[PDB]
Amino acid sequence: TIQGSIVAIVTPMLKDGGVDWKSLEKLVEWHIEQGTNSIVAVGTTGEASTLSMEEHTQVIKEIIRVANKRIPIIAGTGANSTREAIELTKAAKDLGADAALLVTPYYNKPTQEGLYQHYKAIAEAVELPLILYNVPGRTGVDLSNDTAVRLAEIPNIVGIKDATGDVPRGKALIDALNGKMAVYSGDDETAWELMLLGADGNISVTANIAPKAMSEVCAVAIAKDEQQAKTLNNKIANLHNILFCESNPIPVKWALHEMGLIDTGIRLPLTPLAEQYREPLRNALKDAGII
Amino acid sequence: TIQGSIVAIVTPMLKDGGVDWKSLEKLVEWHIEQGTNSIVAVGTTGEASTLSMEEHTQVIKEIIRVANKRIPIIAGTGANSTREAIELTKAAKDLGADAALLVTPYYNKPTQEGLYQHYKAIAEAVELPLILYNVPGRTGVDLSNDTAVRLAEIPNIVGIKDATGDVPRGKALIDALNGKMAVYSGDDETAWELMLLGADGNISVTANIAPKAMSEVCAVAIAKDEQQAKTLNNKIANLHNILFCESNPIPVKWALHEMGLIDTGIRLPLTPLAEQYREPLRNALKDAGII
Numbered sequence: 001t002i003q004g005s006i007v008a009i010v011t012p013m014l015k016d017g018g019v020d021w022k023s024l025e026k027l028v029e030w031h032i033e034q035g036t037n038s039i040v041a042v043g044t045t046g047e048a049s050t051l052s053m054e055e056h057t058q059v060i061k062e063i064i065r066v067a068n069k070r071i072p073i074i075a076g077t078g079a080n081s082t083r084e085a086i087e088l089t090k091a092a093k094d095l096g097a098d099a100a101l102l103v104t105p106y107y108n109k110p111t112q113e114g115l116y117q118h119y120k121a122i123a124e125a126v127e128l129p130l131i132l133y134n135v136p137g138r139t140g141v142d143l144s145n146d147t148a149v150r151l152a153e154i155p156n157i158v159g160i161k162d163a164t165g166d167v168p169r170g171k172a173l174i175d176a177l178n179g180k181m182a183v184y185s186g187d188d189e190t191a192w193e194l195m196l197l198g199a200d201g202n203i204s205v206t207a208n209i210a211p212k213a214m215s216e217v218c219a220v221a222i223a224k225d226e227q228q229a230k231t232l233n234n235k236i237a238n239l240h241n242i243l244f245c246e247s248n249p250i251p252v253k254w255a256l257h258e259m260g261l262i263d264t265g266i267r268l269p270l271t272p273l274a275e276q277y278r279e280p281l282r283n284a285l286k287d288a289g290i291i
Numbered sequence: 292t293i294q295g296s297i298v299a300i301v302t303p304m305l306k307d308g309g310v311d312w313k314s315l316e317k318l319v320e321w322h323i324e325q326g327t328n329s330i331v332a333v334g335t336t337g338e339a340s341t342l343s344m345e346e347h348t349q350v351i352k353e354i355i356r357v358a359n360k361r362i363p364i365i366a367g368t369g370a371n372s373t374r375e376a377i378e379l380t381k382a383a384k385d386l387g388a389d390a391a392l393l394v395t396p397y398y399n400k401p402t403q404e405g406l407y408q409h410y411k412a413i414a415e416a417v418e419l420p421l422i423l424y425n426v427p428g429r430t431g432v433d434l435s436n437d438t439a440v441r442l443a444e445i446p447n448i449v450g451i452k453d454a455t456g457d458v459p460r461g462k463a464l465i466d467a468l469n470g471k472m473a474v475y476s477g478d479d480e481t482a483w484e485l486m487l488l489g490a491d492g493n494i495s496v497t498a499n500i501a502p503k504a505m506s507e508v509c510a511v512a513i514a515k516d517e518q519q520a521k522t523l524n525n526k527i528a529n530l531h532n533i534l535f536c537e538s539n540p541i542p543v544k545w546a547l548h549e550m551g552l553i554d555t556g557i558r559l560p561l562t563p564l565a566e567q568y569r570e571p572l573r574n575a576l577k578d579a580g581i582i
């Protein structure tokens with residue numbers, strides 16, 4: 001069901017690190033006005049790692065409140081402990097989230113069967129649509145297409161965010177699934193191609209700063225309009241590269257501060273974008289017509 | 292200062308995953324009797340990821356209580372949030388831990404400067420000996436030798452566990468530090484090599500099942516006896532390989548179970564060692580004279 005441009009939203013913070021509730025409310029409003037189709041609250045780009053459990057609950061609560069039913073809200077509820085993933089996922093269900101996004105357990109490297117059991121335990125514990133999320137470069141683990149295809153058989157498991165950026169592999173996954181669950185790109189550089197190949201949307205970093213552009217790229221790609229998807233994506237292609245010059249969300253948070261939309265807060269061990277990269281990032285925003 | 296065989300001890304668990312307190316006490320006792328030189332409590336091999344905050348404290352307190360100051364106890368206190376690491380490290384100091392072992396933030400991929408600020412902030416917040424821990428395959432980030440060398444200048448940063456298994460790089464790190472802080476192997480397969488080159492010990496998985504033999508390997512290797520180090524390590528070299536046929540601590544817990552020392556409990560998303568590996572494991576243990 002959830003389709004189109006799904007922003008992996010940052011969590012705006014004041015200089016001391018506190019959540020900037022005013023800026024967040026404004027950012028959600030702007031996404032809705034510009035065409036973003038859905039918001040992932042407190043995922044990787046929203047610094048899930050350095051927000052407390054109460055801060056997760058509050059950010060999800062506020063985004064749902066401001067959205068006011070206009071678009072679906074997906075809560076990031078991943079953990080590397082199955083028991084913890086369950087508690088987070090239950091809390092998101094109770095807050096009224098439309099779905100949960102659950103990165104594979106990171107750092108502890110479960111087996112493929114361990115991945116299967118982890119997600120099946122969560123699906124069986126919480127009645128809420130769940131979206132798998134594979135990002136092997138961050139986690140230390142790769143949820144294979146074979147394991148994804150198995151998990152798609154579990155009630156409540158409704159999609160996977162594939163951040164491999166490996167388009168032949170994502171095509172092979174979409175073809176094997178034959179509709180049984182959704183595939184979302186988690187790689188802005190190749191998302192337009194995965195959507196042209198049958199992905200249901202793009203859970204996007206770039207949409208944080210170009211929401212109207214990315215909403216258009218997703219609509220034309222989902223519609224299978226290859227030329228329009230190529231042309232529209234080309235206008236923002238350089239943004240997809242520059243937003244990872246340091247680990248996301250470091251650059252995207254700097255881009256939003258340059259746009260005047262958030263302040264500079266970001267939580268250790270993350271750091272504001274290194275000084276040397278701020279001019280090149282400004283130049284990319286200017287080239288793109290964003291500032 | 293802490294030298295020798297430092298076991299990264301498992302956290303024994305009952306079938307239902309509850310911590311097995313009696314079996315943990317017995318293990319701590321057997322290590323001390325067998326010649327183990329120090330214990331890391333609630334590290335990666337100890338399932339830090341799946342233990343609650345209260346359980347992290349109880350396990351630390353129990354290992355300290357049982358060891359009764361006969362050997363230094365190092366508390367695993369890493370987190371991917373600098374705030375949470377400071378909290379865990381303070382708690383370990385308060386419980387009487389001799390040192391803390393802090394893996395680089397995983398999953399959120401800080402920059403080298405963010406890793407520097409992370410550990411600087413902890414060292415300044417907590418007056419306790421800190422050991423860095425780099426294992427890039429699990430965490431998605433690699434703390435470079437250059438960054439390690441900067442950090443060794445910071446007062447209470449007293450060492451690093453280098454789990455790269457890359458011996459020339461570990462030698463380059465030892466050489467560059469020139470004694471400013473300790474290097475510990477985090478790779479059983481190469482640990483004897485790294486200690487012959489100047490590492491102060493081995494923060495060891497294999498020591499969970501061969502604590503006497505690994506105590507002797509570390510001692511002769513630290514003594515720079517290359518022949519005896521090689522000879523002694525050969526007897527346990529196949530154990531270093533077999534204990535990683537699925538992600539540690541999966542194989543090591545199974546081994547301790549075959550030895551009659553712990554029950555099969557292990558917490559999702561980890562799983563009990565797959566059946567196909569159990570007979571080979573058992574044969575390796577028989578071959579090494581462990582069972």
Ligand SMILES: [Cl-]
Nearest residue numbers: 008040043044
């Ligand atoms: Cl996300």
Ligand SMILES: [Cl-]
Nearest residue numbers: 299331334335
């Ligand atoms: Cl450890």
Ligand SMILES: [Mg+2]
Nearest residue numbers: 425426427430
């Ligand atoms: Mg590391």
